[PDB]
Amino acid sequence: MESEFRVYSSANNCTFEYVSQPFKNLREFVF
Amino acid sequence: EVFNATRFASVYAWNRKRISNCVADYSVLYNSASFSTFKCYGVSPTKL
Ligand SMILES: *[C@@H]1O[C@H](CO)[C@@H](O)[C@H](O)[C@H]1NC(C)=O
């Protein structure tokens, strides 16, 4: 019933966090 | 909220915090005029 878990992720530093609001349309991304 | 917490950290376990996406509102810590400890040797309060 649960599929939103996480594995390990010791999170030593994680000093940057950008939690923010975000036939199918072709999703194109440039990184 | 950080400065007005209910529990203060101990001496042996010093709590270290890192600040991101924030601004230095110096006026809030400067309006009380309680800067009794002014041993600012090597710096100036005008070049802030
Ligand atoms: C991140 O900061 C923590 C603070 O306790 C430190 O232990 C850790 O080594 C740092 N990791 C880095 C610099 O990526």
Side-chain angles (χ1 to χ4, degrees):
Chain A
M1 191 175 108
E2 216 271 0
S3 151
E4 309 90 71
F5 46 85
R6 184 54 38 70
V7 287
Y8 207 79
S9 301
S10 64
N12 306 3
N13 203 247
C14 207
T15 55
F16 188 124
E17 265 272 33
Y18 200 137
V19 177
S20 51
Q21 308 110 340
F23 156 76
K24 183 226 182 295
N25 304 2
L26 159 85
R27 312 198 299 167
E28 330 195 68
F29 297 85
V30 164
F31 303 105
Chain B
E1 273 202 2
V2 168
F3 267 124
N4 242 9
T6 57
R7 168 69 63 78
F8 207 102
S10 293
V11 171
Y12 70 103
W14 46 291
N15 179 21
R16 164 147 289 203
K17 192 134 176 42
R18 201 253 168 181
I19 298 276
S20 61
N21 289 262
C22 155
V23 290
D25 212 349
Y26 271 107
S27 321
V28 160
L29 295 187
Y30 213 49
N31 56 29
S32 84
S34 205
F35 39 70
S36 78
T37 297
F38 201 52
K39 310 311 167 256
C40 275
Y41 290 130
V43 289
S44 158
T46 43
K47 313 303 163 183
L48 302 194

